[PDB]
Ligand binder design. Structure first.
Ligand code: NA
Lengths: 100, 275
């Protein structure tokens, strides 16, 4: 069966300022089949309130989803996105890097 | 300018774990406005844009009836397709369908689309003429025989040339603050030393709408596409888009590198320099 690997981006909606409420995005695109596990992490722990977009797909039939939540960037808190999919031998963790 | 409406259906078998999943979404341009999820409690087509909320109960009743009827035909298609490909009853499979219309600047019909994939590969598609079918594999050719005999394309063409365009026109006016808008990108470049000897140059486009954008790097005026990491254009969450392009360059050559941005909200293509 066709399988395509998720492309994972973790990023803020707005340029991060410590102490200022913002929105953390994990955007996963380019994947097939549609079953996927996406979690937003703070200091390694799953954020329970996370929302996601409705399943959609691109012209090449690959799927895309947006997972998102409010967050407050700080100096010391570490945010990340964890994705698992049939194409991945183990979950992939992409760390949020605000200096990009 | 030009506009489009698209519906996207995803149907997934899960043998032993209940009836197939069916998810439907509707878009005008890059703005989503409806959904239906067969697993959700409501069992209703639901609004996903503020400007569709005003539609009356006949609309939501009609759309719910229609999308449910589509879920039922897709349920039976998963059987047909499994049988035709001689696949095991245990495995999960995916059908996808996309359809809709494009209008030009005059809001008149320009093109239609009605196309299907099975397990992530083209299966059958209506051609641009809205009369004839592309079917690669043998299974899809069988489908085409049945759809040609049943004059399936004439019904689809009627929706795409008429109803689709009528509703699109209504939505463009009701949602005009969202959909008749261009947000030009806010651009910059960043530099980050990867080491003593090389640096990551990243060219950013932020807060833009619609999603269509081009970002390229040049080195002394030569396109560097082969050496560029271009991320997929991504949603900010607030109805705008973000994109970046990166090159890794030798420390000291930064001024040889220029970023190039084209977006409909720009009066002219923009060049960013290390200047
Ligand atoms: Na996996």
């Amino acid at each position: 069966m066709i399988q395509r690997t998720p492309k994972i981006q973790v990023y803020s909606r707005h340029p991060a300022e410590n102490g200022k409420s913002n929105f953390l995005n994990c955007y996963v695109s380019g994947f097939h089949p549609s079953d996927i596990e996406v979690d937003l992490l703070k200091n390694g722990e799953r954020i329970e309130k996370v929302e996601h977009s409705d399943l959609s797909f691109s012209k090449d039939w690959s799927f895309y989803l947006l997972y998102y939540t409010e967050f407050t960037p700080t100096e010391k808190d570490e945010y990340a996105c964890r994705v698992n999919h049939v194409t991945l031998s183990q979950p992939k963790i992409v760390k949020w890097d605000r200096d990009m | 300018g030009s506009h489009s409406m698209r519906y996207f259906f995803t149907s997934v078998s899960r043998p032993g774990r209940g009836e197939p999943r069916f998810i439907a979404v509707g878009y005008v341009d890059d703005t989503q406005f409806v959904r239906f999820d067969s697993d959700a409690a409501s069992q209703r087509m639901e609004p996903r844009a503020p400007w569709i909320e005003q539609e009356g109960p006949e609309y939501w009743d009609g759309e719910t009836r229609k999308v449910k009827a589509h879920s039922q035909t897709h349920r039976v298609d998963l059987g047909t397709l499994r049988g035709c490909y001689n696949q095991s009853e245990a495995g999960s499979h995916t059908v996808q369908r996309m359809y809709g219309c494009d209008v030009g600047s005059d809001w008149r019909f320009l093109r239609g689309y009605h196309q299907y994939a099975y397990d992530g590969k083209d299966y059958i598609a209506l051609k641009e003429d809205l009369r004839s079918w592309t079917a690669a594999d043998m299974c899809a050719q069988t489908t085409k025989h049945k759809w040609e005999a049943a004059h399936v394309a004439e019904q689809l063409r009627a929706y795409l040339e008429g109803t689709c365009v009528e509703w699109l026109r209504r939505y463009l006016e009701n949602g005009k603050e969202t959909l008749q808008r261009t947000d030009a990108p806010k651009t910059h470049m960043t530099h980050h030393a990867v080491s003593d000897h090389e640096a990551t140059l990243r060219c950013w486009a932020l807060s833009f709408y619609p999603a269509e954008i081009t970002l390229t790097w040049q080195r002394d005026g030569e396109d560097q596409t082969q050496d560029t990491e271009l991320v997929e254009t991504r949603p900010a969450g607030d109805g705008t888009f973000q994109k970046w392009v990166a090159v890794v360059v030798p420390s000291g050559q930064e001024q040889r590198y220029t970023c190039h941005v084209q977006h409909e909200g720009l009066p002219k293509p923009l060049t960013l320099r290390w200047e």
